Design a binder for these strands. Sequence first.
DNA 1: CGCGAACGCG
DNA 2: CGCGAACGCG
Lengths: 137, 137
Amino acid sequence: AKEEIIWESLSVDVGSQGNPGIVEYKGVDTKTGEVLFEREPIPIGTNNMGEFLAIVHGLRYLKERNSRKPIYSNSQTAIKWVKDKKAKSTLVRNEETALIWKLVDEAEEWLNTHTYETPILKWQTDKWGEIKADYGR
Amino acid sequence: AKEEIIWESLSVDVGSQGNPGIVEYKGVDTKTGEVLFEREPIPIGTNNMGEFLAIVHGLRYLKERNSRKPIYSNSQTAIKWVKDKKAKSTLVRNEETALIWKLVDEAEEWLNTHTYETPILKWQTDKWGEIKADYGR
DNA sequence: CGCGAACGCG
DNA sequence: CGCGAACGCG
């Protein structure tokens, strides 16, 4: 069904700046923009770990709800990480990063222990504007 | 002393092709081309590990001999690895790669346990022709 | 600015 | 061919 954007979907995005640094994420209804989940800032993470977590949160939220809506992300790498079931982060493992790493590790565990059919789709910023979940400037 | 090439030097190079695969290296007098050391093929290694080993061999040979000749390599990465005292190879550690990894590990150990002043210089192929130590096509 | 995906040489 | 160095996004 050749319609560009699937509006009945979930858009997820990460909020950063200084990287590694504080990270937060959320999931919004693409069509309506309403926020369907959000994670308060985590003092130390990376953009890509935050976005990885946002997509796996998204999967788990939709799964809970039985819903067939796809998820959109503008991140080539977080999408790849989810599809690979492996978050290939370079972030050091130490006391300050323990929390983000625990969440990422558990997110990976989730992926490798559950089935899902949610399409994870690349949001095309250069044609469709900012992702609705953008924090972000 | 602005003379382009230092002919009274040692040129080192690796022989490959299929990578990872069989690797060998040698050290030659740059001016004369005479081979001053050579390592018989190692069934499994990488180009960059082979060249790393060639440079550290070169350092140890010259050091033995008290000699002030520099060493030339055409490899940006092996030169960086030696200068960093860390061979950042992606080669898997398994039974078939154990030997090359043992040699690399011991080469690193050498570097971090000995002093040397041998300049390690980048051979400029695009201006000075093939490195004399080239196997290599 | 960093995070990560994506030329020479043999 | 692989080995390794060296754009979008927030």
